[PDB]
Amino acid sequence: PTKYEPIFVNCPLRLRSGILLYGYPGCGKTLLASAVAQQCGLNFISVKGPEILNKFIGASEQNIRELFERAQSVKPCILFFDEFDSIAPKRGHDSTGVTDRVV
Amino acid sequence: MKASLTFSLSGIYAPCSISRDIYLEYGDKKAECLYGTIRLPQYGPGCTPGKIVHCVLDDSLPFCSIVVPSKLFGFMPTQPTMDFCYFEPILDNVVPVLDSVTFLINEQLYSKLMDLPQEMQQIQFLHYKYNINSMETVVHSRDILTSGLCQILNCSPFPQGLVDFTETQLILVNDTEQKLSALKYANEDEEYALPKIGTNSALSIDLESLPCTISRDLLRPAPHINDDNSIYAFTDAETLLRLDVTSGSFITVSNMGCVRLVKLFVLLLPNGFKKRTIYAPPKIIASFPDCSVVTISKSNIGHTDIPIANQVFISRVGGWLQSQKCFQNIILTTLKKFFSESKRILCQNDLIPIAFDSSMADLNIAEENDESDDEDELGQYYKNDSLVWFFVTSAELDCFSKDNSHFIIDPNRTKLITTNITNRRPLPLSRSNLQRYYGFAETFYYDLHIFPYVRQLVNILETSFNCSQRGITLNASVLLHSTTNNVGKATMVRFASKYLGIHLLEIDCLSLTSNSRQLDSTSKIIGYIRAKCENVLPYASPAVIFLAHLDSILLDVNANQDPEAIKLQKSINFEMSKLLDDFTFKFPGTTFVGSVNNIDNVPSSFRSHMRFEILVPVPSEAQRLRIFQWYLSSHELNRDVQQKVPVSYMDNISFSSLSSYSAGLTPLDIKSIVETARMTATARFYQESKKCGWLPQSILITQEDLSKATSKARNEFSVSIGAPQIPNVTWDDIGGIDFVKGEILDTIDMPLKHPELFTSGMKKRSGILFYGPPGTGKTLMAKAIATNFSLNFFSVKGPELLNMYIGESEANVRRVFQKAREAKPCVIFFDQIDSVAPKRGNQGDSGGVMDRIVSQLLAELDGMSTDADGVFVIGATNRPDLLDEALLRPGRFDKLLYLGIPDTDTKQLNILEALTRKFVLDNDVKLIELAKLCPFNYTGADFYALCSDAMLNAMSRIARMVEKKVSQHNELTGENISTRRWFDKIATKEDTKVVVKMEDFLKAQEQLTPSVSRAELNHYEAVRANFEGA
Ligand SMILES: Nc1ncnc2c1ncn2[C@@H]1O[C@H](COP(=O)(O)OP(=O)(O)OP(=O)(O)O)[C@@H](O)[C@H]1O
Ligand SMILES: Nc1ncnc2c1ncn2[C@@H]1O[C@H](COP(=O)(O)OP(=O)(O)OP(=O)(O)O)[C@@H](O)[C@H]1O
Ligand SMILES: Nc1ncnc2c1ncn2[C@@H]1O[C@H](COP(=O)(O)OP(=O)(O)O)[C@@H](O)[C@H]1O
Ligand SMILES: [Mg+2]
Ligand SMILES: [Mg+2]
């Protein structure tokens, strides 16, 4: 969609905003990401691991705000999340809402 | 240009002539007829819309004189006429022709009309008696054809234009309740209707104030002398014509309390006023608060009596703007102008009004003023916006006289001496609307039958200010609070003041205070407030100390904060309450109105003291009806839009539609709406070319642009507060969609009057819950129902935002339902996800915050509050067994309703085709197999991927094609050519040829994404849900 932008500029009717990978460990999908990060030329933001959270009250929300703000303000980029489970578990939680407000 | 005007009696319509000088300048050979526009300098702040006129030459009319049929405004010819008027010709024969006209006729004439045998005879009958000639007569809206028997109701599209008997659509009506009887000309009777009475007794008449300043120009007498507009009064040609002369030098108006003097002029022809009454400016009304009129009388007073006075005293009259420190330099300066610019006549113990304005201060006029007298020019630039009174307290006659009264002052010798402050109660609004006279930013006027809170507050203050002070009065103390801001409680307090004449001391905390230094001392605020009150409270009574945004100084004890801060908090809270008591007990008539943005934040130590706090709800549609009529009033729009021609709507708007369509949750700032309307209208006006084929005379607002503006406003408010919209296309109001619709309608109806008259008093109101597989109708139903039968669809949309760490969730949900109660006809859609947690009521997530949330939600869900409340609750769940029946119990969410099953006839291939029609479709995609290749029980939600992935497949194919192309050219012209460079240079209009075909669709379908939920999940939940719903 960046390589062939006149083909992709027209017809904003239907599109898909993102992709989810999963499989057995060691099936190259991290390397797929790496290659797509570098050869494509599209900017690439590497929020690897659950670094999103922060000590202070509700800092996660502000952190995600900042992250997406940088994503938008940088020219078109990929927000790379890995070990997604670490950042978006199921809805139910006995703990504080600081771990699900993020979702 | 300036033109003298006269009135003739030549039929209902006639091309009345003008002087040859004007006519020959434009009635040349370029046109067979002369058309123009006429303009009357009528009373009022602005001016009325102008009127077209048809003219012919006439030599009998003197220099620059015009004639019009006296009826065109509907008054007797004997009445005093225009001194001058404005006229301008219509250039290049650009005369518009109306498209449609409406007529109202009486029973006899209407019957005589339709009894004619043919259309042509009826048209001729219309032509003859009314003298209306096709393509030559210009008619206007609301024109009465004959007095009290027939009228033209309105015209479209233009307010005024020509009529064609075969192109302009003529509509006729009669009705039965006889409007026409009251639709007579203004000259309801002859001049001699009122019997003659001689110079017997006073024969005094009631007193009423003018609506606006009176322009000097329209005066019929000669304003030869530089009398400073000081005492002129006006009457409608009666009670004065009976006297010897209508141009008496001076008139006494009364001596009930003490004598006052006025001068009288006859009101001119086209006026609109109460019959047989006297009109005087505010300075005269000041002396007569009680509307006594006891002895108006005329005498040969002559040209002058007591022409001189020396050392004339003047004194302050209290009130906020008089005492404030900032203004004193200019305001005293301006007094010297008022008392020196022109001659004026004073009375003992009399009030002068003087205007002081717009913070136009520290703006020194000049370093020197000795050389010239040039103040008058500044007035062209100083539009006023506030008034203060000054009280002369005295008269300083030095010689001998009959009485120390009714004396002239001489700018050359009559020097002035100021003295200490005095008190005097202002005028009440119902006695005289002071603001309108001076063109101020007029505060709103309520009708006391429709707004509860203002009636309450005003009566509570009214019983106190004078009704009870004659004995012993309980100190007044009232606090205003509202769940939402901008709801106009400052307007409430100002209106109260204007209605009761009580002086208002508006101490707005934000601007006046200098707090949030958080220095080690609160003495600054205390001294500031106390000193300012002290400066003005003596000799200003009754007074209303109004603290605005009081919550900035007084606030709750956040005892978790650090010590040595809370100590200032205690200090300020207590000390403020001390001032409360001190004012209430030390002074007579202190009332202390307060206003607060949210009541809870006022500390308990202070909350108790006040009594009977007023909740100010947002206005309902009945109030909105009156506030739209206020902003859209005649000369609110015109007030400061100083453009060439005034503004108005004049027709076609329907305030019930504006009030109902989306003005709910527009609680105030309809000014935004009306200003956006003005904007669209004015833009559409000014963009007109000079030729343009047509010319608009005045700005006209239309209901379509107003609706547009309200949609825009709601959209731009959406960012501030979440608000659903109607972004739905080709999928609405399918009344026959399913068997479910009838139940929906028969359950949504009962609590509402218009579908069901019963009040649902004892009957249980209930919501509607839909249940079944996701992805097959739970959202579109809600929007459809809301927008077709209900009015508002302010869904939750945020239940997942359960709570902070503070236990505010209960308050949050309470505010959700208070927003529900706002815009009363509202339906709340529950997403039914996570805030509906309890499966068993004691096992999920400890039953913590969410258990309180659900308990509150079920408690408040339906308390059988009121049918008029209108709060409906709709929701959509996978399972009703998902919950422990805490909020699913009968009486709440009862009448459980099934989503239904589409598999019988899925009626969606058509929808697929229609949607894809926006994309290229005529490539064999239309045929059924694309859908039929999948079992007929196919999921509906999958299509919205089926199409997308197909399109993407197309884009992939074309993309691989160009990937060939580029390579080819790289081999041909050069390998170093960049892909982006190539695809830019060789770019063609055919790049959009995103080839698509059946094989693309089939490949996409068989490649990826079989469905969202197809295999067995949907089937067995569907059947089980239908079974358990019996
Ligand atoms: N296309 C490829 N196929 C297989 N192995 C590859 C490929 N490319 C690189 N490798 C090598 O094998 C590894 C592939 O697995 P890798 O370590 O990337 O998994 P991962 O996606 O990080 O897994 P996980 O997060 O589950 O531990 C690479 O680290 C690299 O050493
Ligand atoms: N009933 C009304 N009719 C016309 N205009 C109104 C009405 N109520 C409010 N307004 C408008 O809003 C103003 C009154 O509210 P304003 O914003 O001045 O203070 P407030 O109501 O105390 O609000 P807040 O507490 O949010 O500061 C008026 O000057 C007018 O412009
Ligand atoms: N019988 C139906 N009633 C209403 N909308 C329908 C129906 N069938 C298909 N649709 C369309 O497809 C959607 C059906 O599922 P929807 O109500 O969106 O549930 P979900 O929100 O779970 O996807 C609607 O939004 C509408 O656009
Ligand atoms: Mg990995
Ligand atoms: Mg306010």
Residue nearest to atom 21 of ligand 2 (CA): B488
Distance, CA of B909 to CA of B889 (rounded, Å): 40
Structure tokens belonging to residue B775: 């992805």
Whether a cis peptide bond, with omega within 30° of 0, leads into B542 is yes
Q: What type of residue is B768?
A: I
A25 labelled binding-site residue: yes
DSSP-assigned letters across all residues of B371-397: S---HHHHTTT-----EEEEE------
| Ligand 4 centroid, distance to A35 Cα (angstroms) | 14
Distance, CA of B441 to CA of B494 (rounded, Å): 12
Binding residues of B for ATP: 772-779
Minimal Cα–Cα distance from A96 to chain B, Å? 8
Contact list in A for residue B833 (CB cut-off 8 A) is: 91
Distance, CA of B131 to CA of B10 (rounded, Å): 11
Residue B605: CB atoms within 10 Å: 14
Choose the residue to mutate in B731, B779, B787, B909 for probing ligand 3, maximizing ligand atoms within 8 Å of C-beta. B779
Minimal Cα–Cα distance from A14 to chain B, Å? 6
Whether a cis peptide bond, with omega within 30° of 0, leads into B157 is yes
State the best of A2, A14, A20, A42 to mutate against chain B, taking most chain B CBs within 10 Å.
A14
- Atom from ligand 2 closest to the CA of residue B446: 1
The dihedral over CA atoms of B43, B47, B49, B54, expressed in degrees to the nearest 10, equals 70
Structure tokens belonging to residue B527: 């001294």
| Ligand 4 centroid, distance to A25 Cα (angstroms) | 7
Binding residues of B: 772-779
Contact list in A for residue B846 (CB cut-off 8 A) is: 94
DSSP-assigned letters across all residues of B894-921: -S-EE----TT----HHHHHHHHHTS--
Q: What type of residue is B757?
A: L
Contact list in A for residue B834 (CB cut-off 8 A) is: 91
Helix (H) or strand (E) holding B314: strand B312-316
Nearest to A6 among B804, B846, B987 (CB): B987
**CB neighbour list of residue B212: distance below 8 Å, 6 or more residues apart:** B43, B44, B45, B436, B437, B439
Query: Helical H runs in B587-693?
Result: 604-607, 621-631, 655-661, 671-686
At residue B337, φ and ψ (nearest 5 deg) are -65, -55
Minimal Cα–Cα distance from B948 to chain A, Å? 6
In 3D, which of B899, B925, B850 has the Cα closest to residue B1024?
A: B899
With a 6 A CB cut-off, is B773 part of the ligand 3 pocket? no
Distance, CA of B399 to CA of B882 (rounded, Å): 100
A40 labelled binding-site residue: no
Distance, CA of B332 to CA of B361 (rounded, Å): 12
Nearest to B845 among A4, A15, A93 (CB): A93
Resolution attained, angstroms: 4.1
Distance, CA of B46 to CA of B211 (rounded, Å): 12
Strand-pairing partners, residue B505, are: B545
Q: Which ligand is nearest to the CA of B597?
A: 2
Quick check: helix, strand or coil at residue B207? strand
Strand-pairing partners, residue B632, are: none
B43 CB burial (10 A radius; 0-12, 13-18, 19+): buried
Of chain B, the end-to-end C-alpha distance in Å amounts to: 84
Helix axes B671-686, B703-720, angle to 10 degrees: 130
Number of residues written out for chain A: 103
Task: List C-alpha distances in Å: B390 to B155, B233, B289.
Answer: 51, 21, 17
Nearest to B845 among A4, A7, A92 (CB): A92
Structure tokens belonging to residue B812: 């949050």
CB-facing half-sphere around the CA of B422: CA atoms within 13 A:
18
